[PDB]
Amino acid sequence: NNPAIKRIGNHITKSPEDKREYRGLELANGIKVLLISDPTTDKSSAALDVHIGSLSDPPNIAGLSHFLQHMLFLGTKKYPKENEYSQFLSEHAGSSNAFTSGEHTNYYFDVSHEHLEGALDRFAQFFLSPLFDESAKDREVNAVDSEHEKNVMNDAWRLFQLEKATGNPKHPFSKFGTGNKYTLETRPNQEGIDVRQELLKFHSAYYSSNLMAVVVLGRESLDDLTNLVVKLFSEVENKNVPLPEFPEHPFQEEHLKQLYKIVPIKDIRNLYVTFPIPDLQKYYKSNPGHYLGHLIGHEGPGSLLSELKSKGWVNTLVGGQKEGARGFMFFIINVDLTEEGLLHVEDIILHMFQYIQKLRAEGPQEWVFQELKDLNAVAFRFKDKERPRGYTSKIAGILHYYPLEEVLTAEYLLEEFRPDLIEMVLDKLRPENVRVAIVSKSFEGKTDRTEEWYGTQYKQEAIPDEVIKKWQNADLNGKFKLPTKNEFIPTNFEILPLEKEATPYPALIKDTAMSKLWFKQDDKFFLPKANLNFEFFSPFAYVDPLHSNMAYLYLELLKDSLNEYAYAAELAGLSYDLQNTIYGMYLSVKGYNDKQPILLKKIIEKMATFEIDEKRFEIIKEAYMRSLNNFRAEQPHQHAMYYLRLLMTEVAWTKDELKEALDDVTLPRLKAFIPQLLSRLHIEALLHGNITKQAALGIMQMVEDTLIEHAHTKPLLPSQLVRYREVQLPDRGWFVYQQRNEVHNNSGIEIYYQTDMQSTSENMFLELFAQIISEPAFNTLRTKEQLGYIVFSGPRRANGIQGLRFIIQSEKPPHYLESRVEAFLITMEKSIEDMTEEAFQKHIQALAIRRLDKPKKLSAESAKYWGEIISQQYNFDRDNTEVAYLKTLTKEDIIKFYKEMLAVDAPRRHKVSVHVLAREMNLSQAPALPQPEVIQNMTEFKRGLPLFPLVKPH
């Protein structure tokens, strides 16, 4: 017996392929705990989920629970140092993060498997004795405000909060979750509120053990993990807090049959149909919402989308249940709109109700349920292994909704067929309780009201009862047939035995002028899955802005045509990715091996015999036109990254050049581009997973024959197979490029300190220095000086050349952010000198563990191999190679590396800065900086500078 534990077990149901060991328990204080034992893991992890969220925010202090989340990382009474938590994890190959939903506050971290207890101890203190230091309070409020600021011009966020502000006004659903400097600092002070206590009271009142769930993953035995949690979580006291419920729906009858005309930031056209439904979480074993979601949201033949897309009204559709909170959910049907789909919205919604009455007319189909059941059964059995950090984080959240034994299976497996639940949910999808929202730029100027927090321009109409009556009286449309039998459902899961000549790293098994085939039979995971990666090289893909446009259009027209066919496969765990690269095309087929060659053959064969529908060419072109112009509205820090990539690469077409060339892309000229693109190619491929060398050679060869036959493809010449170089910066030089963001009101900046080529030596000097400055960069530029919410530091790798980059999104001007960063680098230098030689070799093993963390799923391993192939470096034993060299490094080696390359005095300093201005434009101080040559023309700048060589392979 153990008094600190209320109950144990029984046995946590897991996949047969899962060799981790589990144990569920409920502590005496009511904390539901899952213990994961995995002796093979390189990183240990833990997570806690409090069942209190932003819905429990005080009406007078919006975003308090969100703000409280940020403050827990900033010190406890047992660990008073403001960054003890983040510094500990940083020095032990770990990371941490948290989020705040309406009903949940979730904390999680990972760390080196040897220091789980050390990390967990500091972590547990967050719930026990947090400081909420006031000096930390008036600082971190800016990080929250800067966070909201990035979301203020986000159409997704504006709409998200808009739905909240159109329901019951003081239903907790209406509350502003994020909070800003105003709601958190300004207004409380005006109202005489002390924030530190209303933090402490909220933490006292709501952070009860009664509302908590814990998941810990480590190498330790299940019993060793039991003693660990009990030791440090038995102290969380049980206030016995009643779990918040919201029985009454935020959308009452006054909020139904309503129309919302909304003005967006980007140029988009979308129709949002919403149905209020009760909380279906209770019915998870049968899951009626999923059944309808699968049918309504189906994209196969005879489906709703299939016909709205045929009339040229929509292009995409998402439908199904959207969680609201405990007591209420939503059923949604969202489509994007074409230009004339915007003019036939009444008819579009009519077709929706016509499909709904098709479902009602033929009733619940058990065979469908069975298909959804078997698919979830297969998906669970052969489920890819998850990384500890995200795994513990998710389980900790779902420990509140399901019994301990079902937590791994509950979200996946279905058990009961409930036609009644099917039909009653279906009964609440009627026109009389509908909510319609239209998002288009065409409503600009015609709007009357304005959303409070984001400033959303829109207009609210009551849907004319004339219209409701036409929706209620919806005949059966003969063009809506229920999805047929899914024929991509795998039946062959036999893991083929490891061959005698099997290799630990991908072996080159075909080296012709036409193709280069890399292959490795899976030797670690043993699932029925396989990844087929292909890179098609062609000069005609990126020769000019015109062809880069046509290359995009060609592949997006192709995917559009394959959608009905391929959708069935994705449901059956067989997906494909097809996109245009600067070197040609990229195709990747992932999923179960069984029906995998069928899909691939269908892809390539459609690829080489594509017949273009002109009115799908019109629609997609128009969408692509908007997508390029919508780039104007992305965040300043992304713009800063976009410009740098343009500056430092040999050949790169700007998005504004892509628009001018788009108007001349006629249908006959596109249809003539395709045969010429496929005229001569070179295919570098990686076939990895549950397949043999012979199958792989057959797959690759069947791709070639299909091309040699329908497109008459013959090989490309070796000289045409070279990649793009990176601009070589002059020693002791500094360049600055400056642009403005017409949409966002924050400034962005990327600083790039270029080092020389990627070498086994040069790589690790960069990645070690980056490791050391990782935590202090976040600590200084954000936690202390609060420049912005987005503060990034780390290496930059492109075209075989590396360097150090700083990314900051702030309100302060870039020229100021420049100094702060330069001041920080001086700060780091005199910190590398006064760090103990053991504290140095702690950073080394930290980096070492991160590099030597082996993958845990197939696609993760495939990514690492594929990286070496497209990098044209082919260094498959990079980790063991570079990690070994890393340990050789002394503290002085890094010192002179800074002094020579990165320092302000540096003989070889190569600095480029991108300054994206905002819409309208003691501490440590910086050294005096030289006057930078301002780049006023991108191509002119590149024209006047040398180009780096390309890295020699292997």
């Binding site: 989340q69 940020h70 993060n97 939903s101 199904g320 987005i790």
Partner: peptide, 11 residues
């Protein structure tokens, strides 16, 4: 497609 916004600490 069937379906399947939370404020975070870091990006």
């Amino acid at each position: 497609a069937p379906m399947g916004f939370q404020t975070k600490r870091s990006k």
